[PDB]
Write a protein that binds this ligand. Structure first.
Ligand SMILES: CC(=O)c1cc(-c2ccccc2)c2ncccn12
Length: 114
């Protein structure tokens, strides 16, 4: 079934999803739920899509995965007002991921791979 990089990335995704227990980031945002979204946000992303990409083996590196994670958070902070739940939760997730996938963390991981 899986490869080592796929397992690492599924680990990171599970930990990130735990901060969103209601699933606001689980599926794509549509124009029905968010008026005019498709005008304002050109490159949509969500946790469901990221999971599908991991399973299809579309990510070559943690860099590539981290870039989709930050796009998802930036989209939500661009579209939604600061006072909203969606904005506040996107900021919470963004911090968690930057900490979880820091250069310091990945260095330690790379040292344990000898
Ligand atoms: C992630 C996001 O921007 C989002 C999720 C939702 C959302 C809310 C309830 C149920 C499903 C998604 C939403 N609603 C209005 C404006 C923005 N959003």
């Amino acid at each position: 079934e899986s490869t080592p990089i796929q397992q690492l990335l599924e680990h990171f995704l599970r930990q990130l999803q735990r901060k969103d227990p209601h699933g606001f980031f689980a599926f794509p945002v549509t124009d029905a739920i968010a008026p005019g979204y498709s005008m304002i946000i050109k490159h949509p992303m969500d946790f469901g899509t990221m999971k599908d990409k991991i399973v299809a083996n579309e990510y070559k590196s943690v860099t590539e995965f981290k870039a989709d994670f930050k796009l998802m958070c930036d989209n939500a902070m661009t579209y939604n007002r600061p006072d909203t739940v969606y904005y506040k939760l996107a900021k919470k997730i963004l911090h968690a991921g930057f900490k979880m996938m820091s250069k310091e963390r990945l260095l330690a991981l790379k040292r344990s791979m000898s």
